[PDB]
Symmetry: D2
Subunit: 262 residues, 4 copies
């Protein structure tokens, strides 16, 4: 396998049983990592993910957790440390979204997205970093952001806001913990073939519409993001902290200005 330094590393992944979280889990499995798959409620799906990691050449457990509950996130990290003996890479990937005209957006609906996407990642990051600090481990944190930490997103102001906050949260943590060798980075995916986009990509007109907004011309395969994660988690990225590495087929470069329009 590609990243030899990733062998036997303990990697926790929130939302690790579907879409991007699962591609990441599998890829860390391919690197002979020990993967801790957090899941919200679909245990049968998490078990399939667990199997895939093992099949790929890694070790895997599954831990139920709601990233909006502090006790759950504390449990999630404690379990990784107890079961595998340490923690090396923390991946806050869990996130949700839904379209609502902004002036019509309820506080409850706003809160759900902030709590899940932003505060969820803070809690994970804090628990991981607490462990690295207490134990002198030059650990790693990867937060799953989006092109929407840069690209504003009407009807998804809660989402955009959550990712914007994630950006400064990551950059702050990276700066604060850099002198201890703790690296903190975001990945910013573009439009990806995952369950979050399942209904949208079912409609051939909407799918064609999303594609027209991707300069590279195709919706991303989840393994393309998993590749980014493996790089960032690895010692290949030893001098890289505080960044957002966009994997977006050109989305953040303003797709409407193609061909010299404007």
């Amino acid at each position: 396998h590609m990243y030899t330094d990733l062998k036997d590393k303990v990697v926790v992944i929130t939302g690790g049983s579907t879409g991007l979280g699962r591609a990441m889990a599998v890829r860390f499995g391919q690197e002979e990592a020990k993967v801790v798959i957090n899941y919200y409620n679909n245990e049968e799906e998490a078990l399939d993910a667990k199997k895939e990691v093992e099949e790929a050449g890694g070790q895997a457990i599954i831990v139920q957790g709601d990233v909006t509950k502090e006790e759950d996130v504390v449990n999630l990290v404690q379990t990784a440390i107890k079961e595998f003996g340490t923690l090396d890479v923390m991946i806050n990937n869990a996130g949700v979204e839904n379209p609502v005209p902004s002036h019509e957006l309820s506080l409850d609906n706003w809160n759900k997205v902030i709590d899940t996407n932003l505060t969820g990642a803070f809690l994970g990051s804090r628990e991981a970093i607490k462990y690295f600090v207490e134990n002198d481990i030059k650990g790693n944190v990867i937060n799953m952001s989006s092109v929407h930490e840069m690209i504003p997103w009407p009807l998804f102001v809660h989402y955009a806001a959550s990712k914007g906050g994630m950006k400064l949260m990551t950059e702050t943590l990276a700066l604060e913990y850099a002198p201890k060798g703790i690296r903190v980075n975001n990945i910013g995916p573009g439009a990806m073939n995952t369950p979050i986009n399942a209904e949208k990509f079912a409609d051939p007109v909407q799918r064609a519409d999303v594609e027209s907004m991707i300069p590279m011309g195709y919706i991303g395969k989840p393994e393309e993001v998993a590749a980014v994660a493996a790089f960032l988690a690895s010692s290949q990225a030893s001098y890289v902290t505080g960044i957002t590495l966009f994997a977006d087929g050109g989305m953040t470069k303003y797709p409407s200005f193609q061909f010299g329009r404007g």
Copy 2:
């Protein structure tokens, strides 16, 4: 009396709501919109005689003003603020979401309670404020204006203040999104990003002459900002002089976002 010319004639009689409007930057803004003959609604949290002191100044500067108690983390208080303004003055023209808090905690030691108070105040309160105003603007075909009080820390990361940094980074994307969502209605939404300003949020810090000097050493222009320098920016952004300006963050920071340590060709 109209015994002096004012800079932005289009601001005269405009209804301007300002959260945290009784102190620091909020008060400086309140006073400035008064100077332009605006109808200022000063929101405050607890100190009523402070709020009344500010209402006095808005009037003495040439504006109209009411004070309204409200906690921006409380949804009904935000709805009430916007409702009070429309009831008392007949409309709403400019929403200024300025209330905010901060405190230093090593991030690995930051409690959810503490994180949440900062996120709820700084970011969520600004969303609520913005939502209420834009709701009103939309239902009445008013080309209204929102100003959110961000910081240099929507760009500058801030160790020991990870919650504050996150709240301001969220406000950026919130503001930018609203700006884009509502641009076709001519509703403009913008951030201001102050650097170190001489206000109560910094009073403890600035009382210590070594820290005061340290903060100044991080300001390329070499002095801590006067609150009226920020209000000058809000007055501009709120006015029709900024008609083509939406979705921006206007930093008023004496050069802080330009990386103070790289002066003199260091690095």
Copy 3:
């Protein structure tokens, strides 16, 4: 009487000052009763028309010929402003050019023309003004005319994009370097504006509507809306504002294709 009382009798130099945004700024500074030095490349009568507009608006004005790609022309321009009006207060580097070319087919000469005018021109202007400000303890002001394309990449206009991207870091550097002296240096980033740079494009009704479809606010900007930004930046109202790019773009930098929850 006018908006920014502190702009009265300030000496303001404007490259490309005879057309488009340049002319709109010249007239606006005239309304603020400033002394405007209109630099122009080679249309003397248009520059004379612009001078007449400044004066009527309530300012003073001179016209000075100069090619911003020539160091001696830029030196002469600043020197002329000082000799004629006595000093220099605001340097506006606004001259710029563009043309579409597939990047893999773009000639070096063409690359160079756009780079030298748009970026190196603004450097020369900025350097000359700052040199004067520094030698004479003046708290002067520099405004460089950038574009949304210091942030929005622009296929077929790679030379232009590169020029504005460079101008961004140039301005930010100078602002940092000279802030301790009270010299403010800022960019303006306009979106699509109604000027001669876009005349041929906007005479074509399909292209015109296509550009308008990329402006969230729904209209091509009027030059006066950019001049309003310049007046604000030059004035003491912006006393604490340096090193920024103030986009005036009707929302263009916000990604127009992401409206309506697309993506």
Copy 4:
């Protein structure tokens, strides 16, 4: 022979052109691509012996190398480089524009000649290289790759180095434009943004122990980067591991762009 493992199998036999390939970051990239069993075209300015040494290192690490003299400010020399890569190896896969120069001058003192040398070398040179590679890629339907060596100074302003900073900010928008322009053909274009690195560009500066420590104090990770740390990013960006990655600047800077002065909760 393939007697040892390497990380990126898809880089095997890829043709990789590196300007300034004989020293510093260029040399580390040349070698790393050699470790990946690539075919490396080492462009060099005037020190032939040093280039031949670099050639030897690449071969010893497991690659093929040739050396091509060329001044990146000369159109014909850049054209020659690409044509020589294509003639000698049969194709071109990865174009790396890495040559760059700098020198400290107070900005109001900086000569046109000195400004032009830096702009022509750093920005224009990178344009010509990117143009020639992309021309070839387009004519032959190759899904090629361009890596331009930028700097933290495409984001961090740099007094005394205004020419260098402009050149890198210009590179940012050039790279992002090209990436947008040629993404539909599957040609990927990216920048690397290194922080302070241990190379000949910083040699005089780092031999001064007080400047050395001063620079270190501005790097949050606490150390001057090793050149192979940038090489690692280049290997990544060039591989199909980065298949969905284009138009980006990947900063490898030990945290420099995160504003080193705001550590410890200062400001």
